[PDB]
Structures are given as C-alpha cells and as structure tokens.
Write an enzyme that holds these catalytic residues in place. Structure first.
Site, PDB file in Angstrom:
ATOM      1  CB  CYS A   1      -0.967  -0.033   1.176  1.00 13.21           C
ATOM      2  SG  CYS A   1      -1.251   1.582   1.943  1.00 13.21           S
TER       3      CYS A   1
ATOM      4  CB  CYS B   1      -2.072   6.097  -6.205  1.00 12.87           C
ATOM      5  SG  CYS B   1      -2.478   4.339  -6.026  1.00 12.87           S
TER       6      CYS B   1
END
Ligand SMILES: O=C([O-])c1ccc[nH]1
Ligand SMILES: O=C([O-])c1ccc[nH]1
Ligand SMILES: O=C([O-])c1ccc[nH]1
Ligand SMILES: O=C([O-])c1ccc[nH]1
Lengths: 335, 335, 335, 335
Positions: free
Chosen positions: D91, D256
């Site tokens: 992540c 991201c």
C-alpha cells in the site's frame, strides 16, 4: 510527536448514525445559554469542528456533540451538536447517544430502573430517560419539541423525467420535505445511494427560492436543510422505512429522530389511530426507531403533537485526537 | 469488560511530586465558588479521590487535581486540589502543574513570549505566567495568595521526644508549622523520611485541637494540616531545603510552593530578605523553586506579602481510569 | 507537546499489588526464549522499567509486566515480569494479572466455563485456568513451576539485631528465605512495614554473597532476592499470613503467589499438608490466595512438587505513558 | 460499559489517505511469514477488519495496517495492510504511515539524520528511510518493487458516449489501468467525485473478463483492482495530477504510491529524461508525492525500473476501539 492540541472524544453509533462525544480537551466555554457558548465556539474555536468532522479524522456523513458546563441550574451538563457543515440546534440521534454514553461512562449517576436526564442544547433543554437492565442501558426514549405540518399536497418540479408530481412538507424541530418511492424510481437500499443523494441536494437547494417558510414562534431559521423519502419496510416488526439528506450533502444512517418526530405527525390528523399507538420507523440501512405521541397541542395557526422517540446507542471506542502543528491538513479538508 | 465509571486524567510531575489532573469523566458541578464546588465533591463524589490517590491506582504520597468550569468572572477554567488525606485549599506544584498541561495540550491558546492563565482555588484566583521558548514551555511562575507570619514561635509538645520549645506558624494558601531540622534533630534525607512522616502527623495532630487556628477572612480554615521542617542546603545554588508532611501521612518531593511561599513570607518581617532578592527553596529530592517577594499588602488583621513562586511541570502520560464494579478495592484502599 | 516515546500499558490489581501490563508501544524482540528476551530488555530498553516502576509514574512498591510474541510452541503470547529493583523470573500475581486482562480485553478468545491460557516466563511456561461466570471472569488458578525445599534452616547473621539462628530456604519460581515473624520479633501489620522492608533487604543482601545459591537446571539464577516472613492469621478462613521483601526495598500486598507456592512446597516434606488439602495464604493487607498441592515430580537433584495457586485480578484503568524529552526525570527517579 | 474486546490503534493521514495503525489488543499471530499470519488473520480474526474499516468506526475509503512480531530476524517488526474489501499485499501510503508513526511513537530507535527501517509485509520486505530534523520526521522515501508496462495502446469500450478511445495498462506491485482527461469529460476535482467513481468500478469489473493478465513471476494475483486517471497539475511545484479507484468502490486521497511507482515507468522507455530526474505526482485533493528511479532492470520478457517514492504522514489521534457485545453492528456494516 508534537500535536500542540489534544481533544478527548468518545465515539458512539446511534442505530448506525455515528456521534463523536468530545469530553476532555476544552474545560470551560464562556457563554450563558448553550446558544451563547455555541456562538462563541462558531466564532472563536469554530474549526476544531472541521478537524474532527472532516477527513482525515472524520468523514462527510460524520456527526458529533460537545459535553459542557450546564450554566442553567436544574442539574446534569451542557451539549453542543455539530457536523461537516457546521452545527445542528437539535439532532435527537445526538440526544440519545450523548445520554446513553454519559450514564454508561458515569458523568450521570445511574438508577436501577430508568435514569431521567435533562441536557442543555442551544435549542430547548431535552428530556432523555434511558431504561437500564440492573447494570446497563437497554434503549432511550427522547421527548421531542412540538411538531406539525406546514402545507398539504406540494409537487413543484423534478429535473428528470416526470417533471411534476405531488409531495409534502412539515416541521419536526427543523422543517422537512417528504415524498413517496413511486415517481423517480428508487428502492431505498445501500446499492443506489448516489441518485437519492444527488436528487436530494438539488431538491433541498431549489426549494430555498421563495416557497421558503418561517414557522410561527422563533424567527431566525428559514426553509429546508432536510430532504426525506418514505417507502415502508423490508423488516417484519416495522411499519415504515425512510432515508433523509442534509449537511453539505451528507445522509442519516438512522431513521432520523427530528425527521421521524415530524413524520409521525400527519397520521395524528390523518385518520391512523392516534395517541399512545405503536410505530417503529426504520432507516435505509434497516434499523429501528420507535415513535409514539401523548399530548396533541392544536393552538390556532397550526395543529401539533409533542412526540416521544426511542432508540439505542452503543460505544465504539475512546479517542484522544491530536493535531500535528506541521500537518498542513491538521484541521479539515472537504470532498 | 464492564466498569460503569471511566474517568480521563493527565499525569504530570512538578519537580517530582506528581499531579493527576482530571479532565473528562465528569462535566459539571454548579457550586458557585470553587470551595462550594470542593464541598460538593467531598460530600458527594469523594469516592473518586480515594480511588486515584490511594492504591492500587495511586500511592501513600501521590497528589492530583480537577479542571472545572469557572463560573468566576474572567477565570480561564478553575481548579480543585486533592490528596490521599483530603483537599488542599491551594497548592503551588498543583497550580504550576495544571498551568503547563492546560497550555501544552492547547486547552489554553498558547501565547509566544509568556502565557498568562488565571485559575480559581478558590484560595483566591491565582495568576500563573507560563514562559514558552518558541515551541515549548520553559517554566511556570505562579503568583500566590497573600502570605504572613500568624502567631510567632509558641511552645512545642512531647509525646516523643522531649517536650522541647521554639518553632513558628505562618499562612501561604494553607496554615504551616515551620520548624528547624535541628529543633527535633533530623537531617532532610531519604534515610530518615519515615521519621519525618511519623513525626509531622503526630505534630500536625497535637498542635491542632489545643490552640487558636483562624484566618482574618474566608472563615472555615481553622486547621494547619501542613508541617514544614527546614535546614541549610547541600547545593551551592539553593539557599534552604525543606520537607512538608500532610494528608494521612504523605510527603512532598518539591520544595512545596505553598510551603516555601509561606516561609519567605515570615522573613522580611525579620529583614533577611527584601523585595525581589533572588530566593531558591529546595526539597529533600534535589529539586528547587526560584522564589521572590514582589509586593506587601496586609491582611484585614495583621501585615502580609503576596509571593510569586516559579517552577516546572512535565506531562508523564495520559490515563483513562476505569472501576470494575466487582473489584472490591474499586475505590482504592488505605494500608 | 513533544514526547518522542509513547507506550500503552493496562493497569491491573491482583489482591492489591498492582501490575502495569505493557501492550502496545514496542512490537518486537527476537530473543528466542523469554529469558533471552528478558536479557535484551535489561541490556537495552531497561530505561522503560526505571520510568514506569519508579516515581513519578510508579512508586517504591509498584509491579508490572510486558506482553510479547511467544516464539515458543503453542504458548498463547508469552510475558516478562519487572519491578523497581529489576525483573522477577516468575510472579503469581503478575501471571494471574496478565491472564484476566488478556481474556477481559479479548486478546484471548474467552471460553465460557474455564479459559486455559499458556504464558512463557520463561521460568517454564505456566498454565493459568481463568474461571468465567457467563459474562465475567470469576477467578484465575495459575499452576506454577515445580517448587521444593532447597538447603533447610542454616544459620542467621546479625548486623541488627543479635546473630540469631534458625529459618529456611526454598524455590518456587525464584529463591526464598522463609522465616517466622517470631524468629526476629515482628508482627505482620502496616505499623511495622518500614522495619520488615529495612530488615528484608539487609538480610536479602547478607544471605547472598556468603552462601551457595543454585538451581538443578536452567543455570544462571544463583540469587535468592526474595525474603518471606510468616506468622498465624487474624482471619478464621486464612491459615497463614506473610510479607515478602525484594527489588531495592519494595513489599508485596498479595500473599505472593511465587512466595506461597514455595512455602507450601516445604510442607508435605514435613507432613502438615498432603495433595489437595485446601490451603489459604494471606498477605499483610487482608487479601488471600487459595493454594493446593496437586502433583509431586522431583527436580534433577532433589525431590519437588508443582503447586497451583489461585487468585483474582481487576482492571484499574488504561494508560498511554509519554516521556517529555526535556523532562529530566523522563526515565523516573530513585529517592 | 461492557465491550468484551479492546484494540489500541494510532491514526495517521499519509497525504490525505488515512491509516489506522493497530498497536495493542492482539499480542501474537501464529504464522511464520506475514502471508502465513495474514492467512491466519483472514481465516480466524478476519472481521476485526470490518469493525475498524467499515462504519460506524471507519468509512468506505478508510485504510489501515497491523504492527506485529517480525518472525524474520533482520530486525524491526511485522505489518499487515487492510481495507473495507479485505487486505492489500502492499500500500506504500501504508509503508510511509507505518514507518513515520513507529519512529515518532518510539518502537523504532530514531537517528539524527535519517532512520532506515525494514518492515515485514505479506509481499516483499519494504525499505523506508524517514528523514528527521534533529527531533521529528520531515518525510519518508519508500523504495518500491520493480515496476513495468504490460501493453501499449489499449482502448476497449466505454458505456457513454464515445464508445471506443485509446488507454494504457502497467504494473506497480499491483497491475493498473490509466487513461487521459480528454474522452469522457472530467476535470479531476472534489466536486465531480461520483462520475469518476461510478465510471471507475465498471471499467475495473469489465476488464476482468479475459484481457485479465498474470505478470511473469508470482502466479496468484490476476487482472485489475486499481483504475487510474491523469490530467496534470493545478499546483505550481508539480508536473502531474491523478486519481485512483479500488477497494469495493473506494478511492485514494494521495497520488497513489503503488500507482505512481507504476506511472513513473513508461517515461523511462518513453523519452522523458530518465534516471535520478525530479518528478512530483499530486492527488485529486491536491497533495504531493515525489517519484524518481535508479536501477532500470530490463530482463528479457519486460523492461522494468525499481522506483523510489517519497511522502509525508502525520498522527491524527490515538484510539482504543471497543466492541459492545450487544451492539448488533459491533463489527462492520457496508454501504
Ligand atoms: O435525527 C435528528 O434529529 C437529525 C438532525 C439532523 C439529522 N437528523
Ligand atoms: O507545592 C506546594 O505548595 C504543595 C502543597 C502541598 C504539597 N506541596
Ligand atoms: O505473587 C508473587 O508470587 C510475587 C512475586 C513478586 C511479588 N509477589
Ligand atoms: O499507494 C498504494 O500503494 C496503494 C495501494 C492501494 C491503493 N494505493
């Protein structure tokens, strides 16, 4: 670690609709009545709110209170509601939470049967009862402001596709706007959120044009911040199911206290078996609020009832928020 | 789990002698004056004090407080001091404590040079000035209640050991018996603590209910409760050391602000100290307060002096106390 | 604020004698065995122990522990015990403590009749059986390391007072000097505590580095460190009282599981007790452990017995300790 | 109060995208590698996740980790990512958070310049650096898995209105799907959320039909769970701005990590000035991630680079979640 600020909250969920009950981190707030301290908060501290109610701490549909000094004798303590868009004058699903917590945590010395408690809101002082099973809270009945209907019929305009079609408007402590399931084509369920939410806010905004009405008594609040949609249940021990839009575009996870306290009007003057009758109103998520009424106070210009609503709140952890003074988002950010 | 009551404190230490500052778990006490708030606490919610100050939560010594709503004009929040033995009308390490944390956690909006915060004992309101070095608190400088020599020397008593003779009595927030380390043959060191404790309370008893204790104003007090012994220092910087005994039989690890503020307010009325003239009082544990003697002002009976004592508090963790209702010690225990 | 290190503990009390169970603020210690984990702690992160056990955070007495990852086969999590003076290889109130909380907070999935939890001292693994009354824990019943008489009586020493004579020495997790209250002329009561402390350590010193201390297995120990005194009880229920002195000069408020488990493991090898035969050991503070003597099993040198001691722990609040880097006492202090 | 369960989390926001770092409340998790414990979690504890990641605690776009025992020597500790839809293998905006917290809280002993730290994920062990200014973290560079492009061109199908139009697909640790601003008509800004989110998930789902590809090495993960949209900045010190959809329909508040670590590919083999070149990629909300690369590892079947991404995480309070066992929503509820 740095933080510079440190606010102690307690989380609840009041039949799905969350509540952040701030307890420690701001000891005194000046004002006399909760409105005076409210004004003070909105003017001086204000956007501690943003931080806790916005991301990255909260979310759009987050809601919460602030426990405070009573100031008014009587007893107990003071509360101030709040959300992503500012402050509510009443929230019902707040009054339940607040109460359920206070007793459960201590704060209010609890009884064996049912512990009455009167909390100072910016609006009227509020009467929550909380029934307890020897040790713990089972559920709270909160007695609500006298609620009534403003007009019968409505209809105005809808962007797509029918254009027209009848509706209805009332009060509940705050005004409202209620419609049926059959006109746009929605089945109030988790899956279809967006059309309801997106249809809701435009309906809110475009009936702030001139239809906008002020109720008799208290001249300050005007027109609509609460849009509503009935359908009736998918759960057996119920009788209606309904969703409510508000707060910069947020939604209620509970059937809506102030909302429900308004709806269970109509059926007092519309022939639907009147006083001390059972009614359980359920949410979009599908959880129950019990409604029933007592007094029915007509008084000339309107016909009204003083409604009693019940619900359950549960504690979902204890917080000690802090505000890294370098964190550029340290307060809120809206989306 | 199951607890029923859950209270949110903030551990501090102020030149040793820690303070548990209660912040959250009770929101209200109508009181009026902070004594009429103190009264209420002791005649109702005293069961908190026994819990946090005694074992298992606290210990023999161990001191703390409660943050409140002021009522009082201006007064930034208002405080109540408490110990194992009961409640101190005033406390200079307890104040210095509260001040630091309040600013540190942002409860007070922190000013950049120096942060003036007013708190309510209600042994008067007190004006703490909190020095902050750009980012952080440097030190607190609490300006205390007017202090004075009360009765002068008087005669000592025996039980153990030898009837003996001279000492003195003076006020500085509470009432003190200030006596020399020579006068009964003690040296202020950890090895003897046990003796100083056992001595102090036996004194603190038998110089009460035999004599005249009283305050020119505020009535009520009519109790010393605080035994202060003094010798020279084993530090070049420090001018005098001291221990203080109070509450059931507990000792201070700080020079005792209230204790020091009372001692130097016997000097000058003596001539060994004049206005400003750097003073530095030390405890048993190599920890010091930087006193000075700012302004005279009598007390409606006999002459007096308002002293400003200065020190430092540090945040030593955050507590959410909870009380298992089956736990038989739930409200602490004595030994 | 600014702290740099912030550790999350859980206060318990186990028939008095509290335990601060560390849970959060350090996630790892590769160790291998819980001794090679203990070693690491003491030779690295000991600065935690000084902080939490000593003032300002802890006090003279005050005991705690740390929850870990096991490594060890099965072993549900694994523990390390610690005090002001260092680290106990085993502790029966420290175990009983850890067990309760672990189940209470859901760290362990709680079984309905009795919850079997294995922890790693590594004074062996230990099997605590936690009785739960539908909703809540009733009591813990920790089954301990094999216990035995080590050397028998031997001769006493003086400094104060009188060279004197008989006593005994025995193991039960650590090594104990078990002596009568008559043997040196003490009565187990709060009034004398100071003496028992000052006595115990002076003994605990001078019966070390003069004698043979050793364990048939595990090597290393070669240290008593634990002085246990005993007299009859001022309770009908209880069979014997006792105090235990250890760590710098600190006393137990529980009968001392490890202490009791060692005492009754000298009996039977005496004949005053046989298998089961209800035993109830009491402390100074009217608090009792319900012992029994289940199974023999020698220890690769001389005969021995595994004893199961039973008691109760209660959760007395939740702590997030933080250490201001300017705070000079940051890592506690001695006195 | 009842709760039955009590998990200690620490909140962060990693350039807008929140992270709940669970620290205390589950001490050991069996498995050898993080995947083994992951499988164990997903199979045995599983939906602690739901509770914390769903309402009424979390929200749809909530994300978080679990700190754990390393198991692997090397040093440090173990992490396990998670979200409303289950678990992430990596992540990045988690690896930053996790690291930034650990050091800031303690857990990892911090240096004066830059504190390297290696955390165990279910995927590869991850290298975060965290630059510190004498006392505190400024920002983290996290070195990412070798990332590459799967195909050049793409286009398939879009429901309304154009029908066709070219796109592009790549890796990043997880696959991705990237398009331009000019085809549907969106200006990636807070206001228009719904069209992007609603267009995103259908694009995700309908390229899971048979285009679905498995990269060379590791055969388990297949096709797309991450949809992406570039545009280029509204902020001066930037060069691109982009939003990413995933997780049962959630969205990223940060540019991201895994996404950006994939995008800054393409421009290595597409002539855009190659190694150690500055690149700052910003989010829909409008906050910066720095990207730059080093190694460029071709190897036959693909051409790839080992990308280094940087960002900032800030602590947004400390939680002690609890789970009223009567609360019927005690775990999650999805919307
Ligand atoms: O339930 C209520 O009272 C309320 C206020 C705003 C939304 N719901
Ligand atoms: O610091 C003081 O003044 C004080 C009060 C009680 C003990 N110390
Ligand atoms: O309970 C015990 O066994 C113990 C160990 C240290 C003090 N008490
Ligand atoms: O930034 C990342 O690595 C990530 C994973 C899922 C969404 N974003």
């Amino acid at each position: 670690m740095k933080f510079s600020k440190g606010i102690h909250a307690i989380d609840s969920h009041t039949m799905g609709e969350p509540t952040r009950i701030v307890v420690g981190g701001i000891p005194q707030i000046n004002g006399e009545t909760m409105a005076d301290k409210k004004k003070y908060l909105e003017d001086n501290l204000d956007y501690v709110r943003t931080a806790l109610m916005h991301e990255p701490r909260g979310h759009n549909d987050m809601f919460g209170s602030i426990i405070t000094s009573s100031n008014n004798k009587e007893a107990d303590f003071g509360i101030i509601f709040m959300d992503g868009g500012g402050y509510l004058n009443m929230c019902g699903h707040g009054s339940i939470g607040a109460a359920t917590v206070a007793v459960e945590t201590g704060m209010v010395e609890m009884v064996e049967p049912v512990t009455n408690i009167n909390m100072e809101a910016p609006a009227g002082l509020i009467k929550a009862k909380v029934m307890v099973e020897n040790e713990k809270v089972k559920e709270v009945s909160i007695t609500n402001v006298p609620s009534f209907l403003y007009m019968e019929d409505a209809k105005l305009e809808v962007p797509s596709l029918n254009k027209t079609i009848t509706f209805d408007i009332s009060f509940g402590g705050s005004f409202f706007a209620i419609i049926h399931a059959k006109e746009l084509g929605v089945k109030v369920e988790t899956s279809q959120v967006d059309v309801l939410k997106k249809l809701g806010i435009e309906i809110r905004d475009l009936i702030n044009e001139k239809i906008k009405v002020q109720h008799p008594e208290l001249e300050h609040i005007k027109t609509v911040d609460l849009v509503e949609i009935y359908d009736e249940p998918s759960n057996p021990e119920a009788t209606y199911k309904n969703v409510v839009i508000f707060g910069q575009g947020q939604v209620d996870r509970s059937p809506c206290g102030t909302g429900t306290s308004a709806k269970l009007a109509t059926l007092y003057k519309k022939g639907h078996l009147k006083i001390d009758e059972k009614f359980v109103y359920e949410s979009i998520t599908g959880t129950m609020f019990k409604g029933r009424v007592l007094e029915e106070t007509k008084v000339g210009e309107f016909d009204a009832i003083i409604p009693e609503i019940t619900g359950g709140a549960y504690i979902t952890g204890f917080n000690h928020f802090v505000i890294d003074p370098e964190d550029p988002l340290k307060y809120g950010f809206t989306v």
